[PDB]
């Protein structure tokens, strides 16, 4: 299990650390928070942060299943609900929250504080469109007085026993 930089947005070294992290706040309610983007490691993107995503760059095409656990960093007294929904390849991004409920999806409550594991069944490279995981405000981030009205989540991922890789492939960074 290694960190997935879903918030692959800022390029400032002081805010370069904000990449691992992605926010939730008491502001927006039941609307839309974040799709963790593609469920594809080797495609240029957020997965390049993972150890998995990098070694996939050292090969060509793979087949397997992944598990992506999310971790909540908010206060103890903080509470709320989130539904995480995977959208398989081909299908466009779900129109709304309720649309995500009609498929494979998991409502995450902060009662089961520790974490919540999302297992994506199958992804493959046949070199586009891949699976999508979207995280929705089932409800807003409610907090009592004394709790920060905004909180942060870390997403870290890895591969299961069915993960296999292809032929060696080289493409680096250095000169």
């Amino acid at each position: 299990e290694t960190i997935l930089e879903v918030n692959n947005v800022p390029t400032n070294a002081t805010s370069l650390m904000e990449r691992l992290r992605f926010p939730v706040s008491a502001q927006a309610g039941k609307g839309e928070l974040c799709a963790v983007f593609r469920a594809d490691p080797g495609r240029s993107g957020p997965w390049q942060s993972t150890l998995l995503g990098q070694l996939c760059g050292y090969y060509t095409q793979w087949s397997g299943s992944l598990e992506v656990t999310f971790m909540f960093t908010g206060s103890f007294m903080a509470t709320g609900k989130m539904l995480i929904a995977y959208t398989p390849p081909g299908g466009p991004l779900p129109k709304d929250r309720a649309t995500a409920m009609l498929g494979t999806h998991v409502i995450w409550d902060f009662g089961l504080q520790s974490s919540v594991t999302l297992v994506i069944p199958w992804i493959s490279n046949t070199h586009y469109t891949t699976g999508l995981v979207s995280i929705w405000y089932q409800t807003n981030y409610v907090v009592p007085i004394g709790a920060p009205n905004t909180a942060y989540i870390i997403a870290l991922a890895a591969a299961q026993k069915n993960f296999t890789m292809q032929l060696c492939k080289d493409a680096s960074d250095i000169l």
């Binding site: 709320g80 009609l102 999806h105 409502i107 907090v143 009592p144």
Partner: protein
């Protein structure tokens, strides 16, 4: 209950409570009640249909739902109940509100069979009647009551507890779960035309915070329909 997609794990105190004392059953059909025999497994369409989560303010006056209705463009159930000739099903619904140990209020999740909710307007000034079309077909989002003391129905909540009910006191329980069987004169009725059933969420202690805390409290509704009745038709 491991029937459906994703649940929510709880330390679940005995918040379990069955409608009138009998569990949801199927249909007894070894006579001539229907010569065609509808066949349906338990986890095909018993997905956890969770409506959109609603807010609970201090000036809130309670909300209601109808169950044969609530599924329209809602779920593969609605893609099934709208085209189907006749309908029947039981339900397992779990009302959960997420709040702080600093917020206080009092909820009554209650279940009411035949819910004819009124209604009235002013007087004889412009029109004499016309209760709303949207009284029926209330969406998942809707709807607010108008006079909670009478449920807009000329009947006091003071005695609603005679119906299968369950309390949500933010002092103690954040979760309440109530299971309802089927309840009708005919063993098989039609769906969208008659809302066989009504769900109520009425506040008694209208919630109170001390500011600096989110004034909005989430009431996430989660539904699980048991003992449905279908087969298939046209389109």
């Amino acid at each position: 209950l491991t029937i459906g997609n994703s649940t929510i794990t709880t330390q679940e105190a005995a918040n379990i409570i069955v409608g009138y004392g009998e569990w949801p059953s199927y249909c007894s059909d070894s006579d001539a009640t229907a010569v065609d025999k509808p066949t349906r497994p338990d986890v095909s369409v018993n997905r956890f249909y969770t409506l959109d989560t609603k807010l609970w303010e201090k000036s809130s006056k309670g909300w209601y739902w109808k169950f044969p209705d609530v599924l329209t463009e809602t779920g593969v159930f609605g893609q099934n109940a709208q085209f189907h000739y006749l309908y029947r099903s039981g339900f397992c619904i779990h009302v959960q509100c997420n709040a702080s140990k600093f917020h206080q209020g009092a909820l009554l999740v209650a279940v009411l069979p035949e819910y004819v909710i009124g209604t009235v307007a002013g007087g004889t000034g412009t029109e004499d009647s016309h209760p709303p079309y949207k009284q029926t077909q209330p969406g998942a989002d809707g709807f607010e009551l108008q006079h909670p003391y009478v449920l807009d129905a000329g009947i006091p909540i003071s005695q609603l507890t005679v119906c299968p009910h369950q309390w949500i006191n933010l002092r103690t329980n954040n979760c309440a779960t109530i299971i309802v069987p089927y309840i009708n004169a005919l063993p098989f009725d039609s769906a969208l035309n008659h809302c066989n059933f009504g769900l109520l969420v009425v506040p008694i202690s209208p919630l109170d915070y001390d500011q600096g805390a989110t004034p909005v409290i989430p009431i996430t509704i989660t539904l699980a329909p048991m003992c449905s009745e279908f087969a298939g038709l046209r389109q």
